[PDB]
């Protein structure tokens, strides 16, 4: 009457196979003449109603053993059937109305902790009927509740026993697929193919981390499912964005389940092109720029995002990881900024963690997922919530040396496998990240140089300073060498490109000789500090005289300067 | 104008055949309402697939709409009389997790008819609200997506001003 | 499974050594042990007052220490992760015992899942593996004595969980540079005179067996070099090329890239990083087309594509 019955709706629920064990169990355990009331147990997403409906399709069938033949499942709904008082009582008239098949039925309840363990007070209620033995119930719930709500009473665990109902089995969500294409493809009327459908199975279990185990890859077949459909049977999009495009021109005047994978959660694994082909090729050319002189550490990175991408490389590392070494201001960070701009259209989309305040090993709360135990509000951790729904970034680390012992020792398990649990529990998965450290040991070395001795003396400190453990994990270490005069030349006018393109903002062009770079170099260069005072000089001098003299307008459009030796000498012309 | 995307995005998730009540997500000031009534005007000049041309568009007022008892039952007779078109009416609700996450104790009276699938549901909120309130209860994650919206186009929103120039050319003069 | 057995029991417990004498090569003394160990608990004799087993593993560094574990495990069940794996590296302070261990219920009661209570129940057939047993505070290790001695063990809610079929292994980084430095005999000596002396004299005694791992010859870095290869063998096979090696190439490959200290990782390290780059490399020029086979020879190496 007011709950819901499923004997007439199995003409019409959906097909369940695949699942011959538990129906088993608990045909054998419905006999028994005591403690006969099963419950499911399990996490969320694998089937414990598909597998409740199975065994109603298998008692309407008849396969059942005849012991059982003489039975109808009932099932209580709890919107269906809701003062307090009233609804008590309602239910009371509905258990005692129930009575009249005396051992003939079955009842079924959903989310059996929710209603039963709790609030509203009915424990105690139903009690002593169930201790008794009315009739026979079916639950399922997660393992949490029964964790945390059936263990700290006495009365409960009485009856019931566990049943457990796991899907780990990849070969077997094949066949549910197959067996599930019917309905899709009788609702959808669109032709399909067996190799996305297996490719979809295999991807599915891999890529995309989170919601629970393979069975959901019904959901993704059916994203695509549904796409194809408004493509091409409906109006094309394409001609629609053609002309979306051209109304703003004149008001200013299996390779289908793989795009939408890309689209979720970035990964771009899409079927590669020519346009690919060559921005590939050229990868190194281009990222070849912004650094001078690097070959080494620069076609090693080309080298690790090419094969990456390629479709090779071990299932189970982060995609390598590296240690940079070497003296101050020689352009570290330099090749992590231009290989973040390159790899993507974004400019500071890289994340960077110091741990310049984390001394004390009482940091580890905050680095990490903090436990929920005292009040859980700042469970946020700074490698948390940033890896979460971005899974491409890249992480790069600042002076990793400094830090304590106790810090430093929890990012090895990553490096050794991949994956994190944090306070919560949740896992994390670094299983696409580039990890890039830097430290500045061993400068003293080898700014004092033969350069080999120097490799070595640099070598054997870090060796010595570090456990000789860790330094296996590490994909590679490279040192950077110290640049020349030609490297010099090279990045003055990298450096004065961009004042050059700045003032030409306004409208004046830039133009210089060899003689003013020469000059340049030799007045204001220093062997230990690199790069730096090159700018700061270049600068704080020919900055202010230019713009000292373009106050007094001396300036005029399309007005040209020119420098030369003479120190410098500024020549204004057309 | 300029908001081609997330309008695709909204047309592919509505037609699946479950979990499709989409949930926009982003910071204030982007412009949320506007691809709202962006969407708006594209089913009133019938841009849209034909799927969708039997469809009435109505929003909710929380001003307009408000004993609790009686705002209680005042809500159920709408929810229960709305359900006449049967499938072909979109329910708009701004604001959701104020009126739904808290208090007054809407959540277990909105559960039931919402997981039954009683017709599809559009929200809208900030990130931080979802981070605070949807998270800490298993029951509503089985529905709603994500669906995120950023603009940090500097080019693009010179076309959004030579498009509002015209509105306020013309009152001003 | 103390079910009857049978005859497919039979030849499977026959041929347990010899299928667990493939991922771990010339290590004879270890393999015997813990297949023993097995048979002698499965067959039906043995104390019913000890957890069957318990192993002190010492040796070098990358010798593959945890890859007899993993193929143990592996080859006693299906199953591939389902070993738990216990560290003590954040242990180092004697105020962890209370989440090692089921915690008392006497402050709030609401971390009582200590690290040792609730994978054990449910499952009393898994396999514990320790890890640098040595970097642990004395209390700290002082606690799990009681279960070597007979078993069971009591948590802060006065439940007993026993550990009855579990087959606990440690394993341990102490004595490295004696035994790398070389007699044989003497370094042996010194490895077993320094263990004795670092740790109590009581505790030793229970340990059923304690071994050490044999540094491997030129026989074993060949045969571990081919199996190396063996695996981008197989994963390029997945996409549809064979692979081919002679025996000079795997003596160039041992020749240039091996250490004597840091044992096999190298070896993987650079075959990866130079073979794996330039295959990828060469096909993504599309000069690989289907039923096409590689040969490597040496020279270096020299690639040769044919059909
Ligand atoms: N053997 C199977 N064949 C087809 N579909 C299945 C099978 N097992 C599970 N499913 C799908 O998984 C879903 C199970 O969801 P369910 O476990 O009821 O969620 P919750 O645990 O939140 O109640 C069903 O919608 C069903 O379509
Ligand atoms: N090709 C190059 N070679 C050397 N230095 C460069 C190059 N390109 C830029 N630089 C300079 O190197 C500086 C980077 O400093 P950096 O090494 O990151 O300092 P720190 O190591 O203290 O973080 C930039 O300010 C830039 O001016
Ligand atoms: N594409 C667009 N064209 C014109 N105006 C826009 C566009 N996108 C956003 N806006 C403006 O931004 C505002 C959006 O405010 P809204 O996001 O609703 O605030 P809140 O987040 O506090 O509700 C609107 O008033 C609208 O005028
Ligand atoms: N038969 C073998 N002999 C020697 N080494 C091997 C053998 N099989 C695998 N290995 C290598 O030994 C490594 C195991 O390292 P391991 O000794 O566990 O390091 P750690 O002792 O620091 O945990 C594996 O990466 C594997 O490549």
């Avoid at 003409?11 to 695949?18: R, S």
């Avoid at 549904?226 to 049977?233: I, K, M, P, Y």
């Avoid at 790899?343 to 090993?361: G, P, T």
């Avoid at 770079?517 to 220093?526: A, E, F, K, N, T």
Wanted: hydrophobic share 40%.
């Amino acid at each position: 009457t007011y709950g819901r019955d499923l004997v007439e709706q199995a003409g019409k629920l959906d097909p369940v196979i695949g699942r011959d064990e538990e129906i088993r169990r608990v045909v054998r355990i419905l006999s028994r003449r005591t403690k006969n009331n099963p419950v499911l147990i399990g996490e969320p997403g694998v089937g414990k109603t598909a597998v409740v409906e199975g065994l109603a399709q298998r008692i309407v069938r008849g396969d059942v053993p005849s012991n059982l033949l003489d039975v109808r499942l009932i099932a209580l709904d709890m919107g269906a059937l809701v003062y307090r008082g009233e609804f008590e009582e309602r239910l009371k008239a509905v258990l005692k109305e129930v009575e009249e098949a005396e051992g003939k039925v079955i009842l079924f309840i959903d989310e059996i902790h929710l209603v039963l363990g709790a609030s509203m007070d009915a424990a105690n209620l139903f009690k002593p009927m169930l201790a008794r033995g009315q009739l026979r119930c079916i639950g399922a719930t997660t393992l949490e509740e029964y964790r945390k709500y059936v263990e700290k009473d006495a009365a409960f665990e009485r009856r019931f026993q566990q049943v457990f109902v796991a899907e780990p089995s990849v070969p077997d969500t094949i066949s549910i697929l197959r067996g599930l294409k019917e309905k899709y493809e009788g609702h959808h009327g669109v032709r399909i193919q067996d190799r996305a459908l297996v490719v979809a199975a295999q991807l599915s279990a891999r890529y995309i981390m989170g919601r629970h185990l393979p069975d959901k890859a019904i959901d993704l077949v059916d994203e695509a499912c549904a796409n194809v459909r408004v493509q091409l049977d409906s109006q094309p999009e394409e001609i629609d964005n053609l002309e979306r495009k051209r109304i703003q021109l004149e008001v200013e005047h299996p390779e289908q389940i793989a795009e939408v994978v890309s689209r979720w959660t970035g990964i771009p694994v899409t079927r590669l092109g020519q346009n690919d082909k060559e921005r590939l090729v050229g990868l190194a050319d281009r990222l070849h720029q912004r650094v001078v002189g690097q070959a080494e550490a620069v076609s090693a990175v080309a080298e690790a995002v090419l094969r990456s991408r390629a479709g090779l490389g071990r299932p189970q590392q982060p995609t390598g990881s590296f240690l940079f070494l070497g003296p101050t201001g020689v352009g570290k960070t330099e090749l992590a900024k231009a290989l973040a701009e390159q790899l993507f259209d974004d400019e500071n989309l890289l994340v960077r963690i110091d741990m310049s305040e984390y001394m004390e090993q009482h940091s580890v709360a905050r680095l990490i997922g903090a436990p929920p135990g005292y009040v859980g509000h700042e469970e946020g951790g700074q490698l948390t919530e940033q890896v979460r729904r971005r899974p491409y970034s890249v992480i790069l680390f600042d002076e990793v040396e400094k830090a304590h012992v106790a810090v430093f020792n929890t990012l090895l398990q990553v490096l050794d496998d991949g994956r994190l649990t944090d306070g919560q529990g949740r896992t994390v998965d670094f299983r696409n990240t580039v990890i890039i450290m830097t430290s500045n040991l061993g400068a003293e070395h080898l700014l004092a140089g033969s350069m080999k001795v120097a490799r070595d003396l640099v070598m054997q400190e870090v060796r010595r300073h570090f456990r000789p453990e860790l330094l296996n994990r590490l994909d590679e270490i490279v040192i950077f060498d110290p640049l020349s005069h030609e490297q010099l030349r090279k990045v003055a006018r990298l450096q004065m490109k961009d004042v050059a393109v700045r003032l030409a903002e306004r409208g004046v062009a830039l133009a210089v000789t060899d003689a003013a770079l020469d000059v340049i170099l030799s007045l204001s260069y220093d062997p230990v500090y690199g790069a730096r005072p090159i700018r700061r000089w270049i600068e704080k001098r020919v900055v202010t005289q230019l713009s000292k003299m373009l106050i007094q307008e001396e300036i005029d459009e399309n007005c040209t300067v020119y420098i030369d030796a003479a120190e410098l000498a500024y020549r204004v012309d057309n």
